[PDB]
Amino acid sequence: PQSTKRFFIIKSNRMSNIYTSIQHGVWATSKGNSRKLSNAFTSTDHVLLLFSANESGGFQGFGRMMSLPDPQLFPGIWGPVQLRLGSNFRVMWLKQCKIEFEELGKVTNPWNDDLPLRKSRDGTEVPPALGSLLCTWMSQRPSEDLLAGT
Numbered sequence: 115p116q117s118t119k120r121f122f123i124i125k126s127n128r129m130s131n132i133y134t135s136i137q138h139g140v141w142a143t144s145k146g147n148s149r150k151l152s153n154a155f156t157s158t159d160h161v162l163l164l165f166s167a168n169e170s171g172g173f174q175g176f177g178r179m180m181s182l183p184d185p186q187l188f189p190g191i192w193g194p195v196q197l198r199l200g201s202n203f204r205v206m207w208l209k210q211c212k213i214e215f216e217e218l219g220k221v222t223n224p225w226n227d228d229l230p231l232r233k234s235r236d237g238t239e240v241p242p243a244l245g246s247l248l249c250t251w252m253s254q255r256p257s258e259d260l261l262a263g264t
């Protein structure tokens with residue numbers, strides 16, 4: 115199905131993933147999520163990725179998926195974990211910020227079995243009404259220098 119904008123939660127297990135992603139405009143995900151994001155990319159004007167570190171209580175920003183997984187793109191940049199991921203794809207971060215799940219109140223996701231937004235696993239899609247607002251709220255905050263003090 116075609117659509118204009120779709121929105122996916124991305125979880126990061128180590129902060130260095132986010133720092134590498136910001137420095138080089140790149141991401142990779144599990145093989146199943148890679149297929150899901152690739153299918154969205156070719157049928158949707160904009161695929162937005164909303165980044166949330168495992169260890170954090172919220173989002174560190176959001177970006178646009180710019181290209182499909184490409185085995186030639188930054189091969190092995192994540193280290194040996196590359197062996198259990200799909201191929202790398204380009205991402206343009208549109209905002210670096212700090213927004214806590216708790217700042218949003220107790221939001222649940224009807225496209226994820228009524229789970230709290232804060233319990234979203236990697237690759238969880240959110241409905242556009244919620245995804246658009248999350249991105250709007252992130253954009254309206256001061257940018258956070260995520261790489262400061264790292």
Ligand SMILES: CNc1ncnc2c1ncn2C
Nearest residue numbers: 131141142143144192195236
């Ligand atoms: C750079 N992305 C990743 N790194 C390590 N593990 C991951 C990733 N995505 C999903 N999982 C399980």
